[PDB]
Amino acid sequence: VVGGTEAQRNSWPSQISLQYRSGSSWAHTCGGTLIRQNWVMTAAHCVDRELTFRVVVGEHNLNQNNGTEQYVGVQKIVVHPYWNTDDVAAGYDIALLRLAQSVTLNSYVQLGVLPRAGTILANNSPCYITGWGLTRTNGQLAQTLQQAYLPTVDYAICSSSSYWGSTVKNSMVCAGGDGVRSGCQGDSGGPLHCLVNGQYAVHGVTSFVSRLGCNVTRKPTVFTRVSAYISWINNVIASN
Ligand SMILES: [Ca+2]
Description:
This protein is mainly β. It has helices spanning 155-158, 230-239, and strands at residues 5-6, 15-22, 25-36, 39-42, 53-57, 70-79, 95-99, 127-131, 146-149, 152-153, 172-175, 191-196, 199-208, 221-225. Calcium ion binds next to loops. It is classed as hydrolase.
């Protein structure tokens, strides 16, 4: 997250760190959202590589023991069947990870609330992106969870020529674009939490930013729109 502030330890208890095995240790690669005690929602492109992954819930500082982490293997990966690695702009950048064990819920580990199917936010709706991604374009991962206020940019504006044009689809949410705050590499797959009727819900799964850089004016961060996949998510969970 570029232009973020450190999240308070108990702020975003559905946020997970998706990590891959790297030699004798584990490297954060993406975010995700815990949606059942044994299911995580993340981006498809996070799991294109044939790596060994684990999920960390209750995580806050990647680099130090927080006393609150649970570490759990990924047992099954279900990518959206229409996802195509060569065409992130096509959409479908979503995947569900079934965990090897059910995690224990507490103040640091909670299920993310999902929007009702079809729900679209009015332009400039209040949202926060969270994650441990790069804190600057071509920078380094955050050690502690960051959050940035990123208000939505509605489809009409987002798909106009000076924003994302035809690259953005109505299956996506755009947020930010101020040239100061944005998602950045390592945030992918994580939540965009938006305030609706008094309650934060996870409306976005972080998907991409501009090749020109993370915080680019008129290139808001782009998220898979969770509300376009509610049936799909329910169907996968019901059949696995
Ligand atoms: Ca830690």
